[PDB]
């Protein structure tokens, strides 16, 4: 029986299996090679992944996400108290431990972060089992390099609740390096990891297969969703101009526009323009418009440039110059943005980016390789 590698990401998760010298990144029931880190509770069902995220506009109070921001933290942790303002779902205190409180089948229920994450891991486990055709019992799960003992244990506990023997908890940047075979080489590797909600820069030194985390930098609240937000605000103003109506206080309309903006953003990574066509956005008014890559880049120019500041800090903390970095590794779904690739490459004076592996799959890819080694 094959062991699996799971990237348990802030906003998306990804599962891979290493068989016959190569990694299969496993598509879910909807054909998606990543799955939202989302759990929704309704009057009749518990939804996980695509089904959960797809009804977020309908059911905001009972659609749980960002469990990774809570996992292994105390309720009184300043990060928890600060983050609670970003969430439409209720977080309560159960003996200095945070629980997400929701309505499920007409009853008030509360879940520990590792319980929510266990449901995401169960989905990823089931996705792998559908592909392999037998039950999976062994997994490597990845965490950020800066995760403490509490956050690592809570992540492992999520795995155990999901019915997995957790072979090892390994660092996300290390998994990304393993995906590119950089573990087999001192080599200095910079991991540039821009996801949906978080930006992580890591400098690893690899010496005879041994990894040392020399520096970690970034922004725990900078991600692709910030770029979506810049598009949302742009189109809210456009709708005001054309229809003399403010949609900003209609939560459903804003969430539906946000979904359309995220889809348009993805198109702008491969095309120089994208069409944004929403039926009945507000008071039965259809919103059919477009966005150029250039305008998108203008709207996010400051946010894109800000990604180089943690790169500068990481190099300074690692006591390394640009030329002393041997390999640049692009990971996280947001690194598909051409302007982000340009900024990093230009900063490193034309150096190649390791980007041949789907950036939102590289961490799961490496986890799958390491899972097979440990088996
Ligand atoms: N082609 C693309 N162009 C731009 N952004 C993309 C593209 N594909 C995915 N993304 C973005 O990647 C982010 C998710 O990154 P991922 O690493 O999968 O998740 P996580 O947030 O869990 O780290 C989202 O903001 C999504 O919009
Ligand atoms: Ca943000
Ligand atoms: Ca990611």
Residue numbers in the entry: 4 to 188, 192 to 381
Authors' own words:
Like typical Hsp70s, BiP consists of an N-terminal nucleotide binding domain (NBD) and C-terminal substrate binding domain (SBD) connected by a hydrophobic linker peptide. In the ATP-bound state, the NBD and SBD are docked against each other and the SBD adopts an open conformation, allowing fast exchange of substrates. ATP hydrolysis to ADP causes domain undocking and closure of the SBD, leading to tight substrate binding. Nucleotide exchange resets the cycle and triggers substrate release.
In each case, additional density in the nucleotide-binding cleft indicated occupancy by ADP and the overall conformations of the three NBDs were very similar. Moreover, in each structure, Ca2+ was identified in the nucleotide- binding cleft, where it formed contacts to both phosphate groups (α and β) of the nucleotide as well as indirect contacts to protein residues via several water molecules (inset). The NBD structures also revealed a second, surface-exposed Ca2+ ion that is coordinated by the carboxyl group of D257 and backbone carbonyl of H252 in BiP and homologous residues in the cytosolic Hsp70s. Ca2+ binding to this second site is likely an experimental artefact favoured by the high [Ca2+] in the crystallisation solution and crystal packing. The highly similar CaADP binding mode does not explain the stronger effect of Ca2+ on BiP function compared to the other Hsp70s. However, the IC50 values for Ca2+-dependent inhibition of MABA-ADP release from the NBDs of Hsp70 (444.7 ± 80.5 µM) and Hsc70 (345.5 ± 71.1 µM) were much higher than from the NBD of BiP (57.1 ± 7.4 µM). Given that concentrations of Ca2+ in the cytoplasm are in the nanomolar range, these results imply that the effect of Ca2+ on ADP binding to cytoplasmic Hsp70s has limited physiological relevance. Importantly, the stabilising effect of Ca2+ was greatest for mammalian and Drosophila BiP(NBD), compared to the cytosolic Hsp70(NBD)s.
